[PDB]
Amino acid sequence: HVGTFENITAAPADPILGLADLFRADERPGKINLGIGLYYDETGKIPVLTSVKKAEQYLLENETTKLYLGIDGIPEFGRCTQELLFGKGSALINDKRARTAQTPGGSGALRVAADFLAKNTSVKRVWVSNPSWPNHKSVFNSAGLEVREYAYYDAENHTLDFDALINSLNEAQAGDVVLFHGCCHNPTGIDPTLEQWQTLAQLSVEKGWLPLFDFAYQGFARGLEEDAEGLRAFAAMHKELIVASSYSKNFGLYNERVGACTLVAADSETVDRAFSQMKAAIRANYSSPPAHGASVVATILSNDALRAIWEQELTDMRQRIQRMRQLFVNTLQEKGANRDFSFIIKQNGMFSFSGLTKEQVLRLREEFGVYAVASGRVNVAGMTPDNMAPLCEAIVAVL
Amino acid sequence: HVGTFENITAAPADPILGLADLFRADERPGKINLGIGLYYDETGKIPVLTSVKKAEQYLLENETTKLYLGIDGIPEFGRCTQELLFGKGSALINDKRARTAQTPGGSGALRVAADFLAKNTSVKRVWVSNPSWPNHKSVFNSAGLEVREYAYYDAENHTLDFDALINSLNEAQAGDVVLFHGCCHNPTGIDPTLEQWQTLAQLSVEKGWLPLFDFAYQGFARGLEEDAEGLRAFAAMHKELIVASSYSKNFGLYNERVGACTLVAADSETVDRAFSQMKAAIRANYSSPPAHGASVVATILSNDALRAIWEQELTDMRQRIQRMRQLFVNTLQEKGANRDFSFIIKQNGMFSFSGLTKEQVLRLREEFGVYAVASGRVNVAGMTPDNMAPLCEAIVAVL
Ligand SMILES: *Cc1c(COP(=O)(O)O)cnc(C)c1O
Numbered sequence: 001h002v003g004t005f006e007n008i009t010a011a012p013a014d015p016i017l018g019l020a021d022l023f024r025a026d027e028r029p030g031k032i033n034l035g036i037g038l039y040y041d042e043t044g045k046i047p048v049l050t051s052v053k054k055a056e057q058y059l060l061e062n063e064t065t066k067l068y069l070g071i072d073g074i075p076e077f078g079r080c081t082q083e084l085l086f087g088k089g090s091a092l093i094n095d096k097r098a099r100t101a102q103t104p105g106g107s108g109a110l111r112v113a114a115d116f117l118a119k120n121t122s123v124k125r126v127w128v129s130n131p132s133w134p135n136h137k138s139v140f141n142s143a144g145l146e147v148r149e150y151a152y153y154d155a156e157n158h159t160l161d162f163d164a165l166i167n168s169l170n171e172a173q174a175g176d177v178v179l180f181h182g183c184c185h186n187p188t189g190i191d192p193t194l195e196q197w198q199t200l201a202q203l204s205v206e207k208g209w210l211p212l213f214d215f216a217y218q219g220f221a222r223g224l225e226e227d228a229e230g231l232r233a234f235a236a237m238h239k240e241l242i243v244a245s246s247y248s249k250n251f252g253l254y255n256e257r258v259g260a261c262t263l264v265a266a267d268s269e270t271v272d273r274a275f276s277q278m279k280a281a282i283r284a285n286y287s288s289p290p291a292h293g294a295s296v297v298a299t300i301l302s303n304d305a306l307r308a309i310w311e312q313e314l315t316d317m318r319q320r321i322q323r324m325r326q327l328f329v330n331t332l333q334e335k336g337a338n339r340d341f342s343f344i345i346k347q348n349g350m351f352s353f354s355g356l357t358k359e360q361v362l363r364l365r366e367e368f369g370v371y372a373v374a375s376g377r378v379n380v381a382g383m384t385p386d387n388m389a390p391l392c393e394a395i396v397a398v399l
Numbered sequence: 400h401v402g403t404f405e406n407i408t409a410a411p412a413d414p415i416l417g418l419a420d421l422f423r424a425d426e427r428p429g430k431i432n433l434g435i436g437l438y439y440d441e442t443g444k445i446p447v448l449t450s451v452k453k454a455e456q457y458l459l460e461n462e463t464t465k466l467y468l469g470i471d472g473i474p475e476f477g478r479c480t481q482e483l484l485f486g487k488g489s490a491l492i493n494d495k496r497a498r499t500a501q502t503p504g505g506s507g508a509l510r511v512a513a514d515f516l517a518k519n520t521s522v523k524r525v526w527v528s529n530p531s532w533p534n535h536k537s538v539f540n541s542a543g544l545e546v547r548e549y550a551y552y553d554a555e556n557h558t559l560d561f562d563a564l565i566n567s568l569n570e571a572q573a574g575d576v577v578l579f580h581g582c583c584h585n586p587t588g589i590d591p592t593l594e595q596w597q598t599l600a601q602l603s604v605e606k607g608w609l610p611l612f613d614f615a616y617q618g619f620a621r622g623l624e625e626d627a628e629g630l631r632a633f634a635a636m637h638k639e640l641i642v643a644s645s646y647s648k649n650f651g652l653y654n655e656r657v658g659a660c661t662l663v664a665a666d667s668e669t670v671d672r673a674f675s676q677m678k679a680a681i682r683a684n685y686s687s688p689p690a691h692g693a694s695v696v697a698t699i700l701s702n703d704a705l706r707a708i709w710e711q712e713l714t715d716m717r718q719r720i721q722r723m724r725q726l727f728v729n730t731l732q733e734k735g736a737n738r739d740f741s742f743i744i745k746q747n748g749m750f751s752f753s754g755l756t757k758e759q760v761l762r763l764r765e766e767f768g769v770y771a772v773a774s775g776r777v778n779v780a781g782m783t784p785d786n787m788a789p790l791c792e793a794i795v796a797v798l
């Protein structure tokens with residue numbers, strides 16, 4: 001008999017995660033990793049937050065069992081998540097229109113939404129921005145959903161091309177899903193203004209779209225409440241929406257896989273009925289979510305003292321990235337760049353579409369040991385006072 | 400616009416997890432949970448193992464980062480998994496014919512295998528024993544695979560109907576997947592003898608089946624090495640096979656979601672090519688696996704002193720279940736059963752088919768607060784010296 005695995009075509013490496021393998025293999029001294037979206041501190045390390053360590057100590061001392069969580073996870077984690085997304089006193093919460101499942105990261109939240117939609121609704125099509133996080137297409141395709149792209153980025157002016165965004169969504173139909181990044185658009189770092197969010201909210205209502213928010217960076221643009229303004233403008237107007245959120249980056253809990261999928265419907269009876277099918281889709285995947293990471297988050301958010309520590313740690317991360325954005329622009333000029341990079345200061349979050357070509361990104365890797373994503377996305381949070389001058393000399397050399 | 404969620408029909412309750420919800424809400428103080436497959440100690444608690452607490456203390460004081468694991472998880476966890484499954488010095492390992500991905504539980508390993516098969520091969524059907532774990536059908540169906548049943552249990556004699564098993568499987572074609580439980584068949588507790596395993600292995604290569612082992616109870620039948628004899632008899636003869644294993648039960652790590660999916664192919668080139676698509680299917684699901692539970696397992700297995708403690712804790716669990724099986728049989732006779740229950744002694748693991756009808760199981764819940772699965776599966780590890788008498792009085796009262 002012929003093997004089952006003989007006709008298999010190899011898959012290419014992931015455009016983001018395969019960078020770690022390449023970077024690890026590189027033996028050139030002084031190599032610089034600007035690839036995967038991790039926060040690095042001023043010394044080039046990826047630390048555990050103090051608030052996380054304190055919560056983990058409390059769990060070690062007080063956990064008496066590891067028995068399975070329910071399919072939807074820790075109840076307190078869901079409640080705190082809804083307050084973070086929608087605000088204390090939100091009508092969505094008071095009216096019991098929202099249900100939340102704890103999931104394995106924002107990635108798992110996106111997949112649970114995809115499986116739920118494909119199996120229980122007539123949704124056939126998901127619209128994502130061009131560019132977006134490369135894994136968006138893969139997640140929705142895995143459930144057999146068609147993914148279409150809408151225009152987003154003005155690569156000439158380095159701004160949101162709002163006119164092209166509106167025009168390119170003209171053919172998104174009632175019952176299609178439209179995916180929005182809540183803040184810190186990945187990869188461009190360009191977000192709608194409040195007025196633009198409000199314009200999109202009124203348009204989505206009039207066209208009948210089902211909005212899906214990917215919210216992986218709450219707190220990295222301006223602050224926790226401010227970064228949720230766009231989502232909340234949508235929530236004030238819509239009967240239905242889905243939020244896939246992540247605590248990987250804003251708690252530094254990447255490898256513990258802490259996220260949430262929140263379903264919002266017109267009333268409590270409808271969302272409970274829908275949520276029962278979301279739980280069934282979880283049961284047929286990983287059954288129930290991992291406790292440790294979500295327990296840490298729930299502990300921090302429900303303790304005033306730990307929460308205050310965490311909020312300051314998040315402010316410190318946000319502020320260090322902003323300083324690095326400015327230092328990057330200044331050092332590029334110092335090192336002789338004639339191209340104007342001041343648009344980088346206007347972008348939010350960990351990244352920035354640098355405008356480098358694929359050929360320039362490959363050259364940076366091969367000749368200089370500097371690792372960026374082939375799209376030109378560079379992780380500003382990977383820049384430090386110590387590596388800034390060599391990485392700017394490298395960029396200037398490939399321009 | 401009519402809502403996308405308006406017409407969703409509610410999902411039925413999970414036959415196992417829905418019963419756990421009912422049990423939790425039940426206000427009667429004498430209620431007894433013989434449903435979901437958790438290990439209870441002699442005092443009716445579900446404890447954290449001492450080896451696990453020690454490993455967690457080491458992690459708390461030595462972890463410096465939560466940066467993402469690779470798609471396939473902790474390398475040492477994969478190596479230790481392969482050794483446990485195939486034994487040190489296995490040709491499969493020395494020939495580099497196996498690749499392992501760390502997954503969120505055995506459940507996650509099953510879905511990853513299913514997605515991988517559905518999207519990258521010509522496999523269309525999966526053969527499952529009648530009866531089996533209720534969630535097998537859901538996992539495989541949700542990946543798009545047809546599920547077929549083969550005969551297994553003789554309910555009159557409470558034995559393995561080996562002739563019926565072989566006869567029913569002659570309808571399975573080359574290229575079909577056949578699912579075997581490695582040991583401690585769920586729900587019957589009836590496993591093949593080594594001779595029967597070897598007969599099935601020979602038939603499997605002759606017929607061209609792709610074997611998939613669900614290995615959730617290694618160590619609970621006879622021992623770690625002994626419980627893998629059946630799997631190793633297949634591994635000696637087959638070019639290809641898949642193992643989905645779980646550390647939920649044999650480490651008491653249920654809610655941290657620790658399992659593995661292991662691929663075996665004819666040679667190193669083929670398994671690496673197939674594993675590249677397995678990683679792509681993981682990336683489009685939860686991206687990368689949760690670190691805490693797998694780190695605990697890897698720490699225990701890679702440290703001689705911790706491993707010795709763990710092996711003794713697992714032996715104690717296995718022997719406690721064996722004592723409860725004997726006590727259950729003896730106590731039924733004293734309480735007046737007048738019916739042979741001696742077949743309970745011959746069954747392995749947590750579960751036995753009690754032979755009770757669904758009406759009897761329903762009476763036990765409603766009138767006596769004793770919770771079993773509607774199939775009559777009872778969790779012997781939920782029995783204790785303190786709840787044995789009331790349990791058995793309740794059973795005698797419904798016979
Ligand atoms: C990081 C990220 C995710 C995935 O988050 P995880 O919690 O790591 O799974 C999803 N969407 C975007 C836009 C991200 O940046």
Ligand SMILES: *Cc1c(COP(=O)(O)O)cnc(C)c1O
Binds near residue numbers: 504585657
């Ligand atoms: C427990 C069990 C599983 C699931 O394992 P998890 O690690 O809890 O996801 C799968 N198959 C069988 C037969 C089981 O008993």
